[PDB]
Design an enzyme around this catalytic site. Structure first.
Site, mmCIF file in Angstrom:
data_model
loop_
_atom_site.group_PDB
_atom_site.id
_atom_site.type_symbol
_atom_site.label_atom_id
_atom_site.label_comp_id
_atom_site.label_asym_id
_atom_site.label_seq_id
_atom_site.Cartn_x
_atom_site.Cartn_y
_atom_site.Cartn_z
ATOM 1 N N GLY A 13 0.978 -1.422 0.465
ATOM 2 C CA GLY A 13 -0.205 0.272 -0.131
ATOM 3 C C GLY A 13 1.552 1.509 0.322
ATOM 4 C CB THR A 14 -0.564 4.771 0.284
ATOM 5 O OG1 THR A 14 -1.011 5.011 -0.117
ATOM 6 C CG2 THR A 14 0.435 6.527 -0.082
ATOM 7 C CD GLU A 76 -2.902 -8.747 16.675
ATOM 8 O OE1 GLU A 76 -3.099 -10.231 17.204
ATOM 9 O OE2 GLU A 76 -3.417 -8.044 16.975
ATOM 10 C CG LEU A 78 -5.500 -10.809 12.909
ATOM 11 C CD1 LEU A 78 -4.496 -9.885 13.431
ATOM 12 C CD2 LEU A 78 -6.565 -10.156 12.779
ATOM 13 C CG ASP A 122 -6.643 4.530 2.401
ATOM 14 O OD1 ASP A 122 -7.684 4.110 1.790
ATOM 15 O OD2 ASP A 122 -5.810 3.439 1.132
ATOM 16 C CE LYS A 124 -6.228 -0.023 0.779
ATOM 17 N NZ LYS A 124 -6.118 0.840 -0.284
ATOM 18 N N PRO A 125 -11.780 -3.233 2.491
ATOM 19 C CG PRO A 125 -13.844 -4.168 1.764
ATOM 20 C CD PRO A 125 -12.541 -2.932 1.261
ATOM 21 C CD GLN A 126 -6.433 -4.821 -1.235
ATOM 22 O OE1 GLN A 126 -5.911 -4.248 -1.228
ATOM 23 N NE2 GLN A 126 -6.006 -6.453 -2.385
ATOM 24 C CG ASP A 140 -2.465 0.488 5.597
ATOM 25 O OD1 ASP A 140 -1.158 1.303 5.612
ATOM 26 O OD2 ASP A 140 -3.350 1.036 3.742
HETATM 27 N N1 LIG Z 1 -5.255 -11.787 1.375
HETATM 28 S S1 LIG Z 1 -5.278 -12.374 2.516
HETATM 29 O O1 LIG Z 1 -4.060 -14.009 2.106
HETATM 30 O O2 LIG Z 1 -6.679 -12.957 3.589
HETATM 31 C C1 LIG Z 1 -4.345 -11.722 4.278
HETATM 32 C C2 LIG Z 1 -4.135 -10.559 3.412
HETATM 33 C C3 LIG Z 1 -3.554 -9.986 4.791
HETATM 34 C C4 LIG Z 1 -3.042 -10.600 6.029
HETATM 35 N N2 LIG Z 1 -2.155 -10.014 6.834
HETATM 36 N N3 LIG Z 1 -1.881 -8.384 6.745
HETATM 37 C C5 LIG Z 1 -1.675 -8.493 8.129
HETATM 38 C C6 LIG Z 1 -1.923 -9.128 9.230
HETATM 39 O O3 LIG Z 1 -1.180 -9.566 9.544
HETATM 40 N N4 LIG Z 1 -0.559 -7.963 9.736
HETATM 41 C C7 LIG Z 1 -0.883 -6.288 9.509
HETATM 42 C C8 LIG Z 1 -0.448 -5.775 9.803
HETATM 43 C C9 LIG Z 1 -0.153 -4.828 9.325
HETATM 44 C C10 LIG Z 1 -0.602 -4.495 7.606
HETATM 45 C C11 LIG Z 1 -0.722 -2.930 7.109
HETATM 46 O O4 LIG Z 1 -1.407 -2.986 5.788
HETATM 47 O O5 LIG Z 1 -0.685 -2.144 7.491
HETATM 48 C C12 LIG Z 1 -1.552 -5.569 7.246
HETATM 49 C C13 LIG Z 1 -0.990 -6.854 8.236
HETATM 50 C C14 LIG Z 1 -3.340 -11.893 6.090
HETATM 51 C C15 LIG Z 1 -3.402 -13.036 4.855
#
Ligand SMILES: NS(=O)(=O)c1ccc(N/N=C2\C(=O)Nc3ccc(C(=O)O)cc32)cc1
Ligand SMILES: NS(=O)(=O)c1ccc(N/N=C2\C(=O)Nc3ccc(C(=O)O)cc32)cc1
Length: 293
Positions: A13-14, A76, A78, A122, A124-126, A140
């Site tokens: 991301g950004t 952490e 997820l 920002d 969003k589902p992601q 994020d």
């Molecule tokens: N697309 S998926 O396979 O379902 C997927 C997507 C994302 C995850 N984890 N992302 C993150 C996680 O565990 N801690 C985070 C902390 C910060 C950020 C960020 O973007 O700033 C992203 C994550 C797992 C599977």
């Protein structure tokens, strides 16, 4: 950084690239985010404040590693995001009790952020993360305006505008916590209907999609709208469509709450705290999702 073994890239991301990684010291599995840039002093101080912004519905920031003029954030981990879960649930739909739980929890996380004067900006589902226990967490956020320079698109970035509040699209640079409520409203509608509410691919397409559904805003519904930086009197004047098309087959409590989360005037738009008291949540529960990991 030699203390982390990268497992796989999980996002970008950004503000940077996120990897699933193993902490060689502790054996922990974490999300390691390399911040896209040495790094300014205001960014270090602002990120240090994020370490104290702790809540069950905010992804835990474990450590800030500022070494060799590079910045890494250790969070952490997820296992799945809401975008993937929505896609996995497309044929059947996410059950309403689970939609309601996720919305309630995200409003609890936003009410906490907002009480500490921290905006997500920002949503969003992601960047909404889920686990097997039924929790959902905000990720994020917290790095906007900390690097002291105008935002420039990074190499290969395609910005998602679908969840942006109208005041941002209209050029307000000093927008409020209400922008997060708008974004969460858009996500709520998408969970219910299995379709993005306003899928624009340009700022004007995004703005006109909002106007075609909610009506072109005017001074009656949004006092001051005509003086917004990017407001043009030449905008076409669409009538507000009957709301019954927006989120069928959602009940009247959910439709009422969504209409308050999508008010044009950010001052009229419901707050996270007031939304938590809405009658739609009188029967809220915490169901278990079926996650395929
Ligand atoms: N697309 S998926 O396979 O379902 C997927 C997507 C994302 C995850 N984890 N992302 C993150 C996680 O565990 N801690 C985070 C902390 C910060 C950020 C960020 O973007 O700033 C992203 C994550 C797992 C599977
Ligand atoms: N909070 S937690 O995620 O449950 C967790 C789990 C495992 C750990 N292990 N820590 C350590 C481990 O196994 N070897 C170590 C060697 C050195 C150190 C250190 O502090 O110098 C820590 C660990 C921690 C938390």
């Amino acid at each position: 950084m030699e203390n982390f073994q990268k497992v796989e890239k999980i996002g970008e991301g950004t503000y940077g690239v996120v990897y699933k990684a193993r902490n060689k010291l502790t054996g922990e599995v974490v999300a390691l985010k390399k911040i896209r840039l040495g790094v300014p002093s205001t960014a270090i101080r602002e990120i240090s404040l994020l370490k104290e912004l702790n809540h069950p519905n905010i992804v835990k920031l474990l450590d800030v590693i500022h070494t060799e003029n590079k910045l890494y954030l250790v969070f952490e981990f997820l296992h799945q995001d809401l975008k993937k879960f929505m896609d996995a649930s497309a044929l059947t739909g996410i059950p309403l009790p689970l939609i309601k739980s996720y919305l309630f929890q995200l409003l609890q996380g936003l009410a906490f952020c907002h009480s500490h004067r921290v905006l997500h900006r920002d949503l969003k589902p992601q960047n909404l993360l889920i686990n097997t226990e039924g929790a959902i967490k905000l990720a994020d956020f917290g790095l906007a305006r900390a690097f002291g320079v105008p935002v420039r698109t990074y190499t290969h970035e395609v910005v998602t505008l679908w969840y942006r509040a109208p005041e941002i699209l209209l050029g307000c640079k000093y927008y409020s916590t209400a922008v997060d409520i708008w974004s969460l409203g858009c996500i709520f509608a998408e969970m219910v209907t299995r379709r993005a509410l306003f899928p624009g691919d340009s700022e004007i397409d995004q703005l006109f999609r909002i106007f075609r559904t909610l009506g072109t805003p005017d001074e009656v519904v949004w006092p001051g709208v005509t003086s917004m930086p990017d407001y043009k009197p030449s905008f076409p004047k669409w009538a507000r469509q009957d709301f019954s098309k927006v989120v069928p087959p959602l009940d009247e409590d959910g439709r009422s709450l969504l209409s308050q989360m999508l008010h044009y005037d950010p001052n009229k738009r419901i707050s996270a705290k007031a939304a938590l008291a809405h009658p739609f949540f009188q029967d809220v529960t915490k169901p278990v999702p079926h996650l395929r990991l």
